[PDB]
Amino acid sequence: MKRTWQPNRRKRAKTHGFRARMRTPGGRKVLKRRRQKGRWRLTPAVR
Amino acid sequence: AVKKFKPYTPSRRFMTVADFSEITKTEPEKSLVKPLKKTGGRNNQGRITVRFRGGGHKRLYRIIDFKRWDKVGIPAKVAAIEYDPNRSARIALLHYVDGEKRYIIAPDGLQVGQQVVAGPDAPIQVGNALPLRFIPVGTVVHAVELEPKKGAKLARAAGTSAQIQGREGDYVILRLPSGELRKVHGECYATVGAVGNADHKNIVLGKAGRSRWLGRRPHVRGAAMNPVDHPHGGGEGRAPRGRPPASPWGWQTKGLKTRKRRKPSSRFIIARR
RNA sequence: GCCCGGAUAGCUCAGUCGGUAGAGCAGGGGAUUGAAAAUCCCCGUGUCCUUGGUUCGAUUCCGAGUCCGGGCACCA
RNA sequence: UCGAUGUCGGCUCGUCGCAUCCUGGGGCUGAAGAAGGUCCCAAGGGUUGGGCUGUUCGCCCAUUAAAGCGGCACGCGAGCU
RNA sequence: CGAAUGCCGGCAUGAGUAACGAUAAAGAGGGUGAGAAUCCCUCUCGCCGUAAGCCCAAGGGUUCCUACGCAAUGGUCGUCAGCGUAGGGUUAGGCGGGACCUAAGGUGAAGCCGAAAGGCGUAGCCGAAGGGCAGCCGGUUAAUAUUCCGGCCCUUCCCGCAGGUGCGAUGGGGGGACGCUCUAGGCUAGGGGGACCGGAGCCAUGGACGAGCCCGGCCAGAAGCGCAGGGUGGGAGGUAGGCAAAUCCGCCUCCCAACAAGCUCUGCGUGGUGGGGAAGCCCGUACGGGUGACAACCCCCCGAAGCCAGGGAGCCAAGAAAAGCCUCUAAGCACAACCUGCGGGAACCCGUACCGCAAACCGACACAGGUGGGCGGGUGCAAGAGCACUCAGGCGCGCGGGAGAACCCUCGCCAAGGAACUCUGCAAGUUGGCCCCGUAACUUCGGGAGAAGGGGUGCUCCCUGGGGUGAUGAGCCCCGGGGAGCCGCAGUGAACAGGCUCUGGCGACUGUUUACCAAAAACACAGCUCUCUGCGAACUCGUAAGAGGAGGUAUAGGGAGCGACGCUUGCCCGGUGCCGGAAGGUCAAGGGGAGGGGUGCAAGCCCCGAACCGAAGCCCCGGUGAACGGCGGCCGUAACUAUAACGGUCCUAAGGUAGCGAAAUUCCUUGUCGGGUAAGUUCCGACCUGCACGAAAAGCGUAACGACCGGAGCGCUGUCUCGGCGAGGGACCCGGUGAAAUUGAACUGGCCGUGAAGAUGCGGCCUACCCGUGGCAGGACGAAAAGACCCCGUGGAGCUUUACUGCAGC
RNA sequence: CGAGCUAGCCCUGGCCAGGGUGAAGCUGGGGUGAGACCCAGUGGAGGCCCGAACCGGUGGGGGAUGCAAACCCCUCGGAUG
RNA sequence: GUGGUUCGUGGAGCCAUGGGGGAAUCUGGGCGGACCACCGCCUAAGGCUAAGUACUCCGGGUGACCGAUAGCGCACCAGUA
RNA sequence: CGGGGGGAACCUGGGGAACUGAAACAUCUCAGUACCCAGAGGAGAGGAAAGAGAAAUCGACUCCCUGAGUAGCGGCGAGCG
RNA sequence: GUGGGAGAGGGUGGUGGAAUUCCCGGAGUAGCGGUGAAAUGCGCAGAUACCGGGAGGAACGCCGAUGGCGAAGGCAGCCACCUGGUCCACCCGUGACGCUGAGGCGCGAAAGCGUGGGGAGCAAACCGGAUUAGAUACCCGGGUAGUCCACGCCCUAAACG
């Protein structure tokens, strides 16, 4: 039956992407946290 | 007056459709239509601020002329009577003699072919807009400005009208469609006649879908809900209000008056609904 | 089965700070009427449910008993 | 027994008790005969089909030798419903 | 450290056990190889074929093609592979997207708001599966192709030449530009037939050398032309409107054409040319190549839902925008510029492999699930995308061999009976398509209706009616009518394809719902009523700005109840709510200061403070019932009895009206009576003693409707008496691969007792050689889940209110 | 941090085999003083009917360490709203 | 009206300030816990100002600190699979 | 000419919880903590008396010890200080 | 046919004054109302009585008659429009074209009914005050349908002379 992940590349970038994160103070602190932890990807890969 | 239908389905027994006889022109005046953005009852947050709205037929907005005084003196011909979906009345198309086209809201008896005009001049006759102060006492009128130059406000809806009961100083006394006895400024414009399409209040929608065409989604009673939801939610099988009957937001809904008491306009009202 | 009320004139009922208890209707005797009603004038009257106790004195306060009215008997 | 002993009834499948419903053997009889009453022995076997109700029970129809009463976690849901 | 359903890890038990993932199905020969049911090839067999074939879009991201490989991945095997290693492969001015447009929304100069963060917002900008925009056919590669090649076409930019013209834009105007249902005409796609055209070969097995059988008889194409169709008036005069200007557009008037007449645009046909081109045989191709061939290349018919296209009609619920494009003028320039035609030059960036109803996507899996668009052939069955078979094409589902027990699943049939089964005809069965006949109560006159119940249905010959296309004819195609016969158990001969009736409850209806135990009598629904709301509306969201309401205006909008329709919806305003009430009472801050007090020598500074004035609220007066709500008791009485029209009296704000009633409500209860049955706790009809109906939490009815829930009957049945037999897929055996929960350890019997009260484990007896396999489930208080019931905890959380206290709001 | 599931709305597109029923209207006829109205033919309406796709999820059976953390088979509801 | 302080309205000053009213320039003003007197202290409504102080991404020294289930999550291509 | 963004912890400023404790709980506590925001810097804040507060005293600010769990605050409870 | 007449005959559209009620302003005070008599009710929150302004609906005094007109039901301020029936006169035209009339069709007071409107007065039902043995009556205070308009129904009557 229809499950929860219905991949759509524009949705992914439009929602979790770098320009989104930067757009919002909540989002900019995501980037700050993921940098401080040393995450290799800061943002889902998408494409 | 109200086409009926043989009952060849359920819901076609009681269905009732407008009589469209008066309608002369079956597609609108392209320079006079702009698109309108269906809200679905949502505000500029994304939030429903009016319940049970949405769906419903697409519509183009006919821009209509609720100030007639920026054409003072210029007569116009009534070219067509048209169906505006954004209102219960009908719109009359006006061809002015200087060549401008405008939509007026269509009075009762106004027939295609007629000449119409607006101003302190102008015969007291159906279609003519004037400052109230020049309209003889006792005249029924519609599309009244409430304050001068600010646009027609009162008695725009199909069949409605308003009546001049008197003059006092700079103001005249109208009886509004509601029966309120209001002062209005003498310089306010109004056009003479009732609105027409009076038969409108007698249509019988007849089924659920026909409400849905008009953009009205189903409405659920507080009684139908749970206590999280409504002052009336809950209670085992049915149950009466159990408290003074209320809105979803808790305020009482039989008799509780909501008009702000200190409103400046209170000096100008004489009566009620 | 468990808690609540009530029991006062023939009927329906009020009332009591513990000391002489009343209303309406019924009922009795007179009047009025040709005669019945309606009306008018007189009129009583009950051991205030039983049973113990408190007290000088109990319809009145106390605790039980009857019988009647009420409410309850839920979770499995 | 609450770090679980699934709870009415039906179905399936039995098995036991006897305070015996029937069949077998008895005594007394207010036992003429036939048919009963009552009590005694006896548990080998038997102990119907339907209407109503979830019902157990019970009532009713039509039969019968008879249409017994109980126990088995109100027998039986790692057997079904 | 021995315990914490402890933590981490390792290894056991169950066990060679369940399982190896759709019951579409396999068999042999040959090849290869160390090894072959599993890889390749051939032949046979079977399954899909509105797909299980083919083409797009997402998503995936090398899976593509080739060589060399088989450790692991593959539910077995593997020489194979979507796997390992390596090399190769994706080619565009015209396909898609971007150097175009706007949509919701997003963002956002101006501007507004907010403690900060931020929130809004006009223009503008961004934003597409919409709008605009120039490529078709074939060939080629192991792998790409509208991309490379071949052929024939075309667009934009730049520059130049010629001819034309007041040129000129971000401004004005036109256009773009629109719904739903139905539909005309002419075409095309697509298909069928042909005795005509072309073609290897075929005559078996009794017959046929035949007007035999088998195979094919097209594709694209500028201008021109032809057929069909869309768009569209021409001229003048006035002109104050389209935020300047306009010669444009709009508006008035007069004059011509009414018509595609013309002009224009598009479909299709034809067209210089270019391409393709079967069966069959041969070559070995793993996959194609050769030939067939100088292939033929034509007539008829069916015919779209596609095209002409902005076609036509009707209807109400009234159906985007902007650019491209045309027109007008403005600065400005008119040597510019623009328009047309021809020529040269110039034409960028990203995508392109492969999978794509799935072994490559979403589901931990090579998962019986989910996944949008297009194409989807033939024959037959009334039609069709339905059903059966079948083409192209694709597949036989990555364990097999055997056996032919119980038992299970899916399936077939059954003597007599026919619901006796059971909570219930649950399940199965009957019925079943089309044509004709025929069809009741009741009804809102539509229905009920496919009511019900019947008849027909195949093939053969003869005759015969109308239509389409052709020509008015043959031919092909469609719809039939009548007659005579033939065969079988049977002719919608297989497949797809209602069982029907009566009578109650509930809900009017179609709809909607607890994704994953409830689809309903619940919600919704048209409709009826109350109420609020005069517009900067009430109401909602937001601290605000803002916004929805609504670019709406009382025939409107919000809230609430009721819920089509019919006939109706009584009485009570004491209490609560709401509504009204300029008086009176009370009332906070504030005002006011009679009086008092602190200190100082004093002037003074400071503190308290009565009267009186002083909102809303509340008290008080009154209204209000489709506002929250409520709507009695006792005693007596009639010339048989019984009952009580009648009387009396207590109480209340008023004591339940019509209608209905043992009910989705009735405790007693299987009430009593009647109906139905042989028998009826259910069901239907009555009665009324209504524990505890009753009028918009509506009362009582109602045709029609219902995968709702009762009750009855007919029909028919393996539901049952009462089971039997058969089939296939498991179970069983052999070869391959090989889990799980569970598990203190175990050398793990019965009875009667005992024991923490239900013992393999203790006592006494009894029984009992060791170990397995297939079976059944009585026990191990079997497993699973630290009982969800119940209580406890001064545990939690949702909900309510005239609980307390607060806050928003008013 | 989430509306890539799910619920509503907004913008822009797409889809719905085939058959049946036969509303208004229109036309003709009849009727009348004129009408209402009647009949036929035409017409093609509808939360109309039957049934695929598509959307559902009624009843039963199977599954229950599944093929599946909701599936499969039979049956059944809607199918121009 | 409220925050700060030990000060929770308390006899409640001080410091700050959202609202109202609203001065003076040494004989001016604030303060010493309501207020008044007396006696003292201090000069609001502008600004700046090292050091002594806090911390440890970073380098170094040293452990009656661990020794691969420890020690950082990571001794190893880990904020990775 | 400058600003913008980053930085482990440290700093300041604007805003600011609840569990918890009070063996219930509301004032109180937790706590001006967590956390969000703005800003600083190698530190930051603070700072040169309209101060203390009883001495006729002391002299900017910061930091440690002490004063001292004192003075006080406090449903005069828990506790705070 | 011609020329004349009378009339509340009918359909429509307008329009006037008296009065009742409500509201606003003024003035003014203690009662008003009501009946057999009363009470309910209204009134110092300023009633009644009076004056001024306004709103709204219904019915048309005098004329008015025992009168007129209509087939009946019925029809009454005024104005206009449209329209029926009718009478007289003159004796002009048609030439029996007539009477009645089962069925049919149309009209049809009041009440009632549907869907809208409208609602001052009145007023079934209902409430309240009296009266009474009771009083679901007569009288009093309230009061909703209705009465009024449009459209469509109902089709009754002591629809009677």
Ligand SMILES: NC[C@H]1O[C@H](O[C@H]2[C@H](O[C@@H]3O[C@H](CO)[C@@H](O)[C@H](N)[C@H]3O)[C@@H](O)[C@H](N)C[C@@H]2N)[C@H](N)[C@@H](O)[C@@H]1O
């Ligand atoms: N059929 C034609 C006419 O017949 C009569 O008129 C007559 C008319 O009557 C008049 O009608 C009027 C209508 O009521 C009245 O206003 C006069 N009072 C009255 O005298 C006579 O005065 C003429 N002389 C003869 C005329 N035929 C009818 N009455 C009219 O209605 C009708 O239109």
Ligand SMILES: [Mg+2]
């Ligand atoms: Mg997941």
Ligand SMILES: [Mg+2]
């Ligand atoms: Mg996308």
Ligand SMILES: [Mg+2]
């Ligand atoms: Mg890296």
Ligand SMILES: [Mg+2]
């Ligand atoms: Mg927005």
Ligand SMILES: [Mg+2]
């Ligand atoms: Mg937003």
Ligand SMILES: [Mg+2]
């Ligand atoms: Mg729609």
Ligand SMILES: [Mg+2]
């Ligand atoms: Mg309405």
Ligand SMILES: [Mg+2]
């Ligand atoms: Mg209607």
Ligand SMILES: [Mg+2]
């Ligand atoms: Mg609605």
Ligand SMILES: [Mg+2]
């Ligand atoms: Mg509702």
Ligand SMILES: [Mg+2]
């Ligand atoms: Mg609910």
Ligand SMILES: [Mg+2]
């Ligand atoms: Mg809540």
Ligand SMILES: [Mg+2]
């Ligand atoms: Mg909520």
Ligand SMILES: [Mg+2]
């Ligand atoms: Mg609530």
Ligand SMILES: [Mg+2]
């Ligand atoms: Mg409630």
